[PDB]
Design an enzyme around this catalytic site. Structure first.
Site, short mmCIF file in Angstrom:
data_model
loop_
_atom_site.label_atom_id
_atom_site.label_comp_id
_atom_site.label_asym_id
_atom_site.label_seq_id
_atom_site.Cartn_x
_atom_site.Cartn_y
_atom_site.Cartn_z
N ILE A 1 -11.55 4.21 -0.86
CA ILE A 1 -10.10 4.20 -0.95
C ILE A 1 -9.72 3.34 -2.14
O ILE A 1 -8.82 3.67 -2.88
CB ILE A 1 -9.45 3.61 0.33
N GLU B 1 -10.23 -0.83 -4.19
CA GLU B 1 -10.70 -2.23 -4.21
C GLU B 1 -9.57 -3.04 -3.81
O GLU B 1 -8.48 -3.02 -4.45
CB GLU B 1 -11.23 -2.60 -5.61
N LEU C 1 -4.42 5.07 6.96
CA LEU C 1 -3.23 5.79 6.55
C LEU C 1 -3.52 6.50 5.26
O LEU C 1 -4.33 6.02 4.42
CB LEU C 1 -2.06 4.85 6.40
N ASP D 1 -0.41 4.93 0.00
CA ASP D 1 0.20 3.65 -0.18
C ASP D 1 1.47 3.80 -0.95
O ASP D 1 1.70 4.81 -1.63
CB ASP D 1 -0.74 2.64 -0.75
N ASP E 1 1.32 -12.10 0.85
CA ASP E 1 1.02 -11.31 -0.34
C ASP E 1 1.42 -9.90 -0.24
O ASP E 1 0.64 -9.04 -0.54
CB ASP E 1 -0.48 -11.46 -0.66
N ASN F 1 -0.20 -2.77 -0.53
CA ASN F 1 -0.53 -2.99 0.86
C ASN F 1 0.53 -2.52 1.87
O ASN F 1 0.56 -2.92 3.02
CB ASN F 1 -1.04 -4.40 1.12
C1 8QT Z 1 -7.45 -0.62 -1.55
C2 8QT Z 1 -6.47 -1.65 -1.05
C3 8QT Z 1 -6.00 -1.40 0.38
N1 8QT Z 1 -5.46 -0.05 0.49
C4 8QT Z 1 -5.53 0.68 1.62
N2 8QT Z 1 -5.13 1.97 1.53
C5 8QT Z 1 -5.11 2.74 2.63
N3 8QT Z 1 -4.68 4.01 2.55
C6 8QT Z 1 -3.96 4.55 1.41
C7 8QT Z 1 -4.83 5.48 0.60
C8 8QT Z 1 -5.78 6.26 1.19
C9 8QT Z 1 -6.57 7.08 0.43
C10 8QT Z 1 -6.38 7.10 -0.91
N4 8QT Z 1 -5.45 6.35 -1.54
C11 8QT Z 1 -4.70 5.56 -0.77
C12 8QT Z 1 -5.53 2.20 3.84
N5 8QT Z 1 -5.60 2.73 5.13
C13 8QT Z 1 -6.00 1.70 5.83
N6 8QT Z 1 -6.26 0.57 5.11
C14 8QT Z 1 -6.68 -0.75 5.63
C15 8QT Z 1 -7.91 -1.27 4.90
C16 8QT Z 1 -5.51 -1.70 5.57
C17 8QT Z 1 -5.90 0.86 3.82
N7 8QT Z 1 -5.95 0.05 2.74
C18 8QT Z 1 -5.01 -2.46 0.89
C19 8QT Z 1 -5.59 -3.85 0.87
O1 8QT Z 1 -3.82 -2.53 0.11
#
Ligand code: 8QT
Length: 292
Positions: free
Chosen positions: A13, A15, A77, A80, A121, A126
């Protein structure tokens, strides 16, 4: 690593600030989850977040400490808000959807804040969205457990754009008001399709805030001149009207935003008070135009 035998990594997904994030399927149950792997008090406090459940908080399903790694298993999910914003750059996100998102995020904050849990943050990256019109706060509670570093685990710069002025000025104790500030900045960015305060260093961040909101003084923020990083030599900028800052936001929206961006954290509106604001009189829950 052994833990990862429980899951098929489906894709990366991204970093995060602390570790890599994977979409995974639990090899046994077939549950699709997001797995955050962090390379290593924090265990205890993060574990307590499993009870911090709300529809506008990304569900923390499990906290596993194993072989110098900490794995956090979350609800998955599909998108974002940062990517949704970028995808919406030509048209803008419709006002009713902005309003619904802001209302939902305030509910999430009201909940977490009632339990004395801060995020610290918040940023579009997020804030996670689903196809049903929900938005949820991710990474709640991680900054307390780990700190907010200057760079991420991959050396990326941690954005300063959403950071409250009390943090920039060196205040030791964060109140729940830091999250309201961040959410105000995000609200404005949704409306205008540009970041409100895109600082590229702490001083640039602070100066961009001051250029818009005025250089803070004792009038507006008692005690600001005694903050650790306050300098009497800061330039004195005048405050700009919100009508300039966030067109075409309506009067109720500009009022609320102003209250979310008060300098004094003791004056800044709370999440509970925000939910009662007239801006939300006509709030609805529209379904966002999405493709997955
Ligand atoms: C990379 C930074 C993290 N991002 C993030 N995105 C998530 N989905 C959005 C997404 C999915 C596929 C492709 N593009 C975006 C997500 N679904 C649960 N989580 C937990 C880990 C919270 C997700 N985390 C967070 C730290 O912003």
């Amino acid at each position: 690593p052994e833990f990862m035998e429980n899951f098929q990594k489906v894709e990366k997904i991204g970093e995060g600030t602390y570790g890599v994030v994977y979409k995974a399927r639990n090899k046994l149950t077939g549950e699709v989850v997001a797995l955050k792997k962090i390379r290593l008090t924090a265990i205890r406090e993060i574990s307590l977040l499993k009870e911090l459940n709300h529809p506008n908080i990304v569900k923390l399903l499990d906290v596993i400490h194993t072989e110098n790694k900490l794995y956090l298993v979350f609800e998955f999910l599909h998108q974002d808000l940062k990517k949704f914003m970028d995808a919406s750059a030509l048209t803008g996100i419709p006002l009713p959807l902005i309003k619904s998102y802001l209302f939902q995020l305030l509910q999430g904050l009201a909940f977490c804040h009632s339990h004395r849990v801060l995020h610290r943050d918040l940023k579009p990256q997020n804030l996670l969205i689903n196809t049903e019109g929900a938005i949820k706060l991710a990474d709640f509670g991680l900054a307390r457990a780990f700190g907010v570093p200057v760079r991420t685990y991959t050396h990326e710069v941690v954005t300063l754009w959403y950071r409250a002025p009390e943090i920039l000025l060196g205040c030791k104790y964060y109140s729940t008001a830091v999250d309201i500030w961040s959410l105000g900045c995000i609200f404005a960015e949704m409306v205008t399709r540009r970041a409100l305060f895109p600082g590229d260093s702490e001083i640039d961040q602070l100066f961009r805030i001051f250029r818009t909101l005025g250089t803070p003084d004792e009038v507006v923020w008692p005690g600001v001149t005694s903050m650790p990083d306050y300098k009497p030599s800061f330039p004195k900028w005048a405050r700009q009207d919100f009508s300039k800052v966030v067109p075409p936001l309506d009067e109720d929206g500009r009022s609320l935003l102003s209250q979310m961006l008060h300098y004094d954290p003791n004056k800044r509106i709370s999440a509970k008070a925000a939910l009662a604001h007239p801006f939300f009189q006509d709030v609805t829950k529209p379904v966002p135009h999405l493709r997955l």
